[PDB]
Design a protein around this ligand. Sequence first.
Ligand SMILES: C[C@@H]1O[C@@H](O[C@@H]2[C@@H](O)[C@@H](O)[C@@H](CO)O[C@H]2O)[C@@H](O)[C@H](O)[C@@H]1O
Length: 553
Amino acid sequence: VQMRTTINNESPLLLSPLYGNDNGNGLWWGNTLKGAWEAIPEDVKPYAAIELHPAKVCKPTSCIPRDTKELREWYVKMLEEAQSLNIPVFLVIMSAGERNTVPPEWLDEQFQKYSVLKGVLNIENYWIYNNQLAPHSAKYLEVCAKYGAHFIWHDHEKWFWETIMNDPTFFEASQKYHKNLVLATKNTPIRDDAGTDSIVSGFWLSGLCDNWGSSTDTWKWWEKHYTNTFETGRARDMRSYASEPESMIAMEMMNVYTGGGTVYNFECAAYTFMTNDVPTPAFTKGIIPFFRHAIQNPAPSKEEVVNRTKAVFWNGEGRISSLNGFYQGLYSNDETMPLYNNGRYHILPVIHEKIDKEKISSIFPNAKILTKNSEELSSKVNYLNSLYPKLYEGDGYAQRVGNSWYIYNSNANINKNQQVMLPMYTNNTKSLSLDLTPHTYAVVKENPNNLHILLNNYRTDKTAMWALSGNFDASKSWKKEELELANWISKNYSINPVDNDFRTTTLTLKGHHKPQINISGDKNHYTYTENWDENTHVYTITVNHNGMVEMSI
Ligand SMILES: C[C@@H]1O[C@@H](O[C@@H]2[C@@H](O)[C@@H](O)[C@@H](CO)O[C@H]2O)[C@@H](O)[C@H](O)[C@@H]1O
């Protein structure tokens, strides 16, 4: 059967969600199916689809898709709409521990009828686990395999993913139907961010799913009790899900991309996508620019990831869920948040206990297999450092990915700059340094005879939103106050974003004739000064920006 969606490093997938309403036109946040697909740029459309989450249509609990007459009616109403407009769609059919979800035969029927139905999602179960979730998912995966569709499972936490793949039914189904399976993170619960990336990407490396990815959830900002950027001492509310810096959304995507991931999903959509059919700056100037990077520059392939891996951690003699300080001293000081401090080790893969040690040896013949009982873990950092050489100086995040450097400031909500000094692997320049403010990322690609540099620090001032009067408590999710915030967003944030405060990124090329650069960027959102020292052959460009800047040197 032909695959309904091609998903790989050369053809990544961007998911944008719509949510059901139990009234009106049947959709929340004032959006429509037509407006959703209208929001997706024409160059991105070949690599995109719309997620349909029944949300408020679900009864007795919103977002929990218990099979009902009304639920089916809603799926069918939306499928009819999407089919008429040739909009590729995925249905959320499992969530939050629900055991009585739509029958596999019902889904089979819908695949038969609707060419636009590309697959289904299972989302979020770590707080409400039961032993039916894995076998149910396995059955739906088999249905997906029948029709060339994809089953996408977003979930989180080390113990949880360990538990899922220990299920004999789901482990078997994964071995059979890996082509049709996507396993993905969902960093909502502000725990296990590093371990989850290692285990989920490890499933992909182990051949249990052909693609992995993420649901990047700005509700994490609410979970942390964070408010306006860098602010302390204010009570959280729904405005917190609209306050994670736009460029930081893209940095979360970069963690997936550079780990070989290929599927990107997002919450909360009132911030990350659209309200009243007006796409938001988080979407247009955060998610879209990074997704375009991923379309234009294929993520590391499975074999590239395998080949760069010097060690793996195998859960076979004790599990990563039992080593809560594992990533300390290596690359994450704080698993409650997604940003990595260090790119020296990439994402270290964690291999699941159901994969035999002989198979690991076969997949990664050149990697050390660490286990919990490895004597080398008595000096964990020194040992890993003997395998992964130090590649840069400074306190910023930098990762070497083939012929490129991937860089960001790792400070999530502390207003402090970071610096990196990056040795270079061609004689275009000897070394390249960056001074980065928070919520700035960069990508430097070394071509044979030029450097391509991408800078993006886009972050709107959230102050105006935080200054509004009213009750925006999260207990009014799915209620009129949430619409009120969404209505404000479509008339203020999305049309008159407060993005005129520029921040400075300083780029220095040491040991680089005075370059004649080609520079562009977001209209009216950057200025720059250049400096050339002909004796030292040092070129400095000082870029003041709020948004994207691109150069070829
Ligand atoms: C079960 C999930 O429900 C919704 O997500 C919830 C959010 O709306 C918010 O309350 C966060 C705070 O942690 O919790 C989530 O459960 C859906 O958006 C999601 O896709 C799941 O179906």
